[PDB]
Write a protein that binds this ligand. Structure first.
Ligand SMILES: [Zn+2]
Ligand SMILES: [Zn+2]
Ligand SMILES: [Zn+2]
Lengths: 48, 44, 1131, 66
RNA sequence: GAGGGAACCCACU
């Protein structure tokens, strides 16, 4: 998102990057919240 | 060293990094010799 | 001629011996796997649709005929070999057979004819093979051939070898499919609900469940709604009937209510008709259905297609899935609504979930079929992707490169290895523990684990009903054998003569019913349904019959002579409800019963005489089934039969309590399982003690298998001198307990001697123990392998050198030979190297990764085996042998739940003695008996005294009137002993007679696996965890004990605050941090340079030293990671 | 697995009696009469031979590694 | 003079 704001980019791709950053930060804090997919390790197990 | 073949009961010399195969019958499961060290059992 | 009552016991055990000579004990596993291999794999391949692919060129791929080979091994050379089960166990191979298939690829071009390519016998993966099944290499081999292959002939088979580990598929309970079950949901909006988990027969597909429910009173009236698959909202049932193609209320009520002269059914269907009056056309009803779908289409015609697809393909697949089969579906849905109204009226009883005729048992067959269905769908998906890619940009694709055999092979291997029944990426949302490592501590544990049933209800559930011993478990599930703790009642075991049905095609029964005067549902007016009998075949209402009694007589006659109807087909006449239900599907648990006609057994003396020469006449159990003498009755049919417990119930006078017996139990003691059948006199014990013995007979050390010298199991236990019991049951003749026994007949005196047997303890004779009494051997296997984890990394079996290897464990390495492996016959201790493996470090070019012996487990290297693994590296397995002499604290149990640790061992001159000089081998406390009421222990001791004096093996079959305590007492008094088993014992220390007379005699005891030397553990200081810096887990890692929360509460109540601080701070994890005196955050402290600096305050002098647990520092840093500021203030 | 040398309870020699006991049973003796002919009077010595399972015979049906 | 975690299963009081 630093790249997508340092050079020009569309509003929707910036919003999608914001959504992904929000998901990653929230799943760093809370990975068992309802309504969203669980953050998972590539083996398929969820993260702690 | 000397390994007994599991199937054909024969003893075979195997060096290190040599694949474990019986030179007679090509059986891949082989067993070590009983040791020559001296082991004492109390008869208890 | 009729069997006289004096010959009846001998005759019934003859027919039981014939049954176990034919079927054995693991017949359900082998039969399910054989059905899966022969029928289910081919059917799954057929039901998979052909692949149609267009960019244009059209390619049609059609999988036609499977081929399964015998289990073969391919080494890195590539030459196939017949792979033996011991080779699979030793080399950690998967005992699997390659599965080939015939594929046809047709090419359809524009302006060109169809082109056929016949890819015959195309390899698509490897199916793991159940041991001693049809496609196992041990099939049909005699006992001599099995011994020449280093296999135990007593080994049952019934398991798989996955990576060298023996895996058993535990049978899984489920609700029965295609059957209407009406329950009353509590504390819900529904007063009653009808449920049908509909699954189409002759195919492996998921079950679609429909809920025909009725709303509660609390609403002008109570209405019937339908919860359909792939429909979000509930739909009124009249709308579903209109969308099925019946718009008039008269036709819908004819499909629902069969007797129109019944007004209360009309009264209850009035609210549904009133609710769904606004829809009056089929298309409007389909629109209403499609408006509540998974994704409602914007086009109304798309909603019509979606609703039609739901109502045809996904609504009740078992009654019909093809086009124009809607009248059978309408009659079945009307039958569901009629059953709901019958439950609503109280005119029919609600269905029982715990009733075990409403349950099916998924054995290895159905479970492996579910797996293979999913994975063949995945393989076709990947073939479709590959061929799509090479027809999109290219023109042609190679089919042999299209198929990924890793899918089927590694999916079956993964699900059998882990027990997670599903996919590797979806392990969290799949059922676990379906596949378990096969218990090999005793032969009884092996048999019990091979005949194990499991309710897949979560063990955290605190409701009692699934755990309860249901009435319908008689003769099907052992009433004694259940685990203790969280899995009580949920994990069950098979009774000895219980057989789980394997499945059959309904087509012969359906044809016979079609031309045995049953009229179809399509060809009848509904007015004929009211007085006729509905006929269900695998839960499919196929027609009605006007004469149900002669129809059931004809069907029973056909099944009894093994005509059109096969023996495992269940046929139930619900006489009060006017229904005949015929079940041919798999998972129905049944048992054989003697047929009784007019208060007489059809088993005569001619059958018993023919069975006495089973290996001369070639008369077998199957001939007895074909004679119409015995027949298999399942739980649903057993609810309509009238069982005589014994033939004495038949030969009874003017008031026989019943003159209409239909069946007779072969022997009632056959209601027990494998582990409960070794209990002598189980009907003289309290039932929880029989449960405890059923638990502990799997922990008893004997000789678990005959070929234990070939096998290198991780844990193995072999008794020196296992004895068959002096007091046996007849059911033990088929558990092979006479050939692989677990225990010793012990002279047990029940006495209070020196106080060392109190509170479930035993005193053992030290002189007996010196003579080999209950001496055992512990075998432990250690596996290691060289592995090429990268090009530079190379683990190698070498004898290491101190000046060359990095990071040794300060141990001796001289006992290793120069191949890096210790030799057999060498004494080893806890700090000794047995496998010397070095890994190259990318002057210390390699570091030490040697395999060490487990600590405090002294022993002698019994065997060393060197081989090649699957991927061709050197693989060593070392069996170390240690002799376990009985010790204070070793667990011992009789066969009656009388567990106990050895409290002391006295020598022969210290033990009390009889006037003949007999000292007890074991002294147990009298107080173990009264609250337990294990009277079968006392009767076994008395019967064993009689047996050892007479020179015979005492019979302790449970329900036996020929054996009585008075008869055993008189027999004992005939041998010069007191009739009640008491003897005058003399004190060993003083020689004086004990004033009381001591009950003493032979009783079968078992040495349990729980030695004190496998449990004793102390830690002073040692290894700690990386994260929280607290001591480790378990004695195997030199860990500490948990001073848990309850211990913390207890030390709070004691008031010992300094002991609480010692345990929870400075015996676990002392730590020192430096915090700012202003902000309270942990500062940066350089103790070497004395630079105590706090960033965020520019503070270099107001820093304080705080002693805290390392876990509290970790907690505070985790909170700071969560943007919380825990500020430690020293003021 | 093999017959014990001693009776566990008293220490009477029973290891020289298993083949004699099998020969007596082959000679149509009852088990009690066969035990009585071998001098096993105490029932502790009689459970040695009565309850013995001779598993070594079936172990000898496997080809030896050594 | 001491270098993995996780998951699951069995068992013990
Ligand atoms: Zn060989
Ligand atoms: Zn600060
Ligand atoms: Zn004796």
């Amino acid at each position: 998102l630093r790249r997508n704001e340092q050079n020009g980019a569309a509003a929707h791709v910036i919003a999608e990057d914001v959504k992904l950053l929000q998901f990653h930060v929230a799943t760093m804090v809370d990975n068992e919240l309802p309504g969203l997919p669980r953050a998972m390790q590539k083996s398929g197990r969820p993260l702690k | 060293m000397i390994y007994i073949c599991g199937e054909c009961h024969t003893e075979n010399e195997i060096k290190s990094r040599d694949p474990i195969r019986c030179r007679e019958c090509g059986y891949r499961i082989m067993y070590k010799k009983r040791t020559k060290r001296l082991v004492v059992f109390d008869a208890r | 001629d009729e069997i006289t009552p004096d010959l009846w016991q001998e005759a019934c055990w003859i027919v039981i011996s014939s049954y176990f000579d034919e079927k054995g004990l693991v017949r359900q596993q082998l039969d399910s796997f054989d059905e899966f291999i022969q029928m289910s794999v081919q059917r799954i391949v057929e039901d998979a649709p052909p692949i149609d692919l267009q960019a244009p060129p059209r390619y049609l791929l059609k999988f036609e005929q499977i081929y399964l080979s015998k289990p073969t091994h391919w080494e890195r050379d590539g030459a196939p070999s017949p792979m033996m089960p011991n080779e699979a166990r030793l080399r950690n191979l998967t005992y699997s057979a390659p599965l080939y298939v015939d594929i046809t690829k047709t090419v359809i071009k524009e302006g060109e004819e169809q082109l056929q390519t016949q890819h015959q016998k195309t390899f698509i993966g490897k199916i793991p093979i159940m041991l001693r099944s049809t496609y196992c290499l041990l099939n049909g081999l005699t006992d001599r051939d099995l011994c020449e292959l280093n296999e135990c002939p007593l080994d049952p088979g019934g398991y798989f070898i996955i990576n060298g580990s023996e895996k058993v598929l535990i049978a899984q309970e489920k609700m029965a499919t295609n059957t209407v079950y009406v329950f009353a949901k509590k504390d819900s909006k529904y007063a009653y609900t009808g449920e049908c988990r509909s699954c189409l027969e002759n195919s492996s597909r998921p079950t679609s469940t429909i809920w025909v429910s009725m709303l509660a009173r609390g609403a002008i009236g109570q209405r019937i709604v339908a919860t359909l698959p792939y429909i979000k909202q509930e739909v009124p049932i009249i709308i579903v009937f209109r969308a099925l193609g019946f718009v008039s209320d008269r036709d819908i009520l004819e499909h629902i209510i069969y007797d129109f002269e019944d007004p209360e059914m009309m009264e209850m269907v009035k609210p549904s008709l009133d609710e769904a009056f606004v829809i009056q056309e089929q298309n409007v009803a389909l629109n209403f259905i499609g408006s509540r779908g998974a994704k409602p289409g914007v086009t109304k015609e798309k909603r019509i297609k979606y609703a039609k697809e739901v109502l045809q393909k996904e609504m009740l697949p078992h009654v019909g899935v093809s086009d124009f089969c809607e009248t059978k579906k309408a009659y079945f849905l009307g039958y569901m609504v009629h059953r709901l109204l019958l439950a609503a009226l109280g005119r029919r009883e609600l269905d029982d979930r715990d009733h075990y005729g409403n349950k099916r048992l998924d054995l290895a067959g159905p479970l492996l079929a579910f797996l293979f269905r999913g994975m063949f769908k995945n393989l076709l998906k990947e073939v479709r992707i590959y061929a799509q890619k090479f027809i999109d940009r290219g023109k042609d694709f190679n089919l042999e490169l299209a198929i990924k055999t890793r899918i089927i092979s590694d999916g079956l291997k993964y699900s059998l290895a882990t027990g997670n029944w599903g996919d590797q990426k979806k392990a969290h949302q799949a059922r676990a523990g379906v596949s378990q490592v096969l218990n090999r501590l005793t032969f009884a544990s092996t048999l019990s684990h091979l005949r194990r049933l499991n309710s897949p209800i979560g063990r955290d559930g605190k409701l009692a009903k699934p755990r309860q011993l249901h009435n319908t478990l008689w003769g099907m599930v052992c009433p004694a054998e259940t685990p203790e703790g969280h899995a009580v009642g949920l994990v069950k075991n098979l009774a000895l003569m219980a057989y789980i049905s394997v499945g059959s095609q309904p087509s012969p029964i359906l044809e016979f019913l079609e031309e045995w005067s049953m009229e179809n549902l399509e060809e009848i007016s509904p007015a004929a349904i009211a007085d006729a009998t509905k006929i269900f075949v695998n839960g499919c209402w196929v027609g009605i019959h006007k004469d149900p009694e002669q129809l059931m007589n004809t069907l029973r006659k056909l099944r009894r002579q093994m005509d059109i109807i096969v023996s495992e087909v269940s046929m139930i006449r619900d006489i009060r409800e006017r229904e005949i239900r015929i079940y041919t599907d798999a998972g129905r648990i049944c048992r054989p019963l003697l047929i009784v006609e007019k208060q007489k057994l059809l088993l005569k003396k001619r059958h018993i005489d023919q069975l006495k020469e089973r290996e001369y006449n070639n008369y077998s159990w199957q001939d007895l089934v074909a004679s119409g003498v015995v027949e298999y009755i399942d739980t649903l049919e057993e609810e309509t039969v009238m069982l005589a417990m014994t033939p004495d119930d038949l030969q009874e006078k003017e008031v026989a309590y019943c003159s209409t017996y239909t069946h007779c139990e072969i022997h009632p003691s056959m209601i027990l399982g494998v582990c409960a059948s070794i209990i002598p006199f189980p009907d003289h014990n309290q039932s929880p003690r029989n449960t405890y013995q059923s638990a502990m007979g799997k922990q008893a050390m004997g000789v678990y298998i005959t070929n234990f010298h070939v096998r290198m199991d991780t844990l193995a236990h072999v008794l020196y001198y296992p004895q068959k019991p002096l007091v046996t049951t007849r059911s033990m003749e088929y558990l092979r307990f006479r050939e692989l026994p677990a225990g010793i007949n012990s002279i047990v005196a029940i006495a209070s001697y020196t106080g060392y047997n109190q509170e479930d303890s035993v005193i053992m004779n030290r002189s007996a123990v010196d003579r080999g009494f209950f001496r055992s051997v512990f075998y432990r296997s250690y596996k290691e392998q060289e592995s090429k984890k990268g090009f530079d990394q190379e683990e190698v079996f070498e004898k290491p050198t101190r000046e060359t290897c990095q990071g040794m464990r300060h141990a001796i390495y001289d006992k290793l030979d120069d191949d890096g492996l210790i030799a057999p016959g060498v004494r080893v201790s806890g700090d000794d190297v047995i496998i010397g493996k070095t890994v190259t470090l990318p002057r210390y070019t390699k570091r030490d990764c040697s395999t060490f012996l487990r600590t405090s487990e002294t022993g002698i290297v019994d065997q060393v085996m060197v081989t090649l693994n699957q991927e061709g590296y050197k693989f060593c397995k070392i069996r170390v042998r240690s002799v376990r002499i009985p010790q204070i604290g070793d667990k011992f149990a009789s066969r009656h739940g009388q567990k106990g640790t050895c409290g002391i061992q006295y020598r022969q001159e210290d033990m009390p003695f009889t006037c003949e000089g007999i000292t007890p081998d074991i002294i147990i406390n009298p107080h173990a008996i009264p609250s337990r009421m294990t009277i079968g222990h006392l009767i076994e001791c008395l019967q064993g005294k009689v047996s050892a004096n007479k020179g015979e093996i005492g019979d302790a079959t449970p329900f036996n009137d020929a054996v009585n305590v008075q008869k055993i007492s008189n027999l004992l008094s005939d041998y010069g002993y007191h009739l009640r088993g008491n003897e005058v014992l003399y004190n060993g220390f003083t020689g004086r007679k004990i004033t009381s007379q001591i009950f003493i005699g032979p009783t079968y005891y078992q040495r349990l696996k729980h030695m004190v030397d496998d449990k004793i553990h102390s830690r002073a200081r040692g290894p700690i965890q990386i994260l929280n810096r607290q001591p480790m887990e378990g004695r195997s890692r030199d860990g500490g004990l948990r001073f848990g929360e309850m211990e913390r509460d207890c030390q709070i109540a004691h008031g010992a605050a300094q002991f609480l601080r010692e345990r929870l701070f400075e015996a676990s994890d002392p730590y020192q941090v430096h915090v700012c005196n202003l902000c309270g955050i942990m500062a940066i402290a350089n103790t070497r340079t004395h630079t105590y600096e706090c960033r965020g305050c520019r503070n270099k002098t107001q820093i304080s030293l705080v002693r805290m647990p390392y876990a509290c520092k970790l907690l505070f840093q985790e909170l700071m990671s969560m943007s919380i500021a825990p500020r430690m203030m020293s003021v | 697995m093999i017959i014990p040398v001693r009776c566990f309870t008293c220490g009477k020699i029973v290891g020289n009696k298993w083949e004699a006991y099998l020969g007596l049973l082959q000679a149509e003796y009852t088990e009690g009469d066969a035990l009585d002919a071998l001098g096993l009077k105490r029932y502790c010595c009689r459970r040695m031979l009565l309850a013995h399972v001779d598993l070594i015979e079936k172990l000898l049906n496997y080809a030896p590694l050594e």
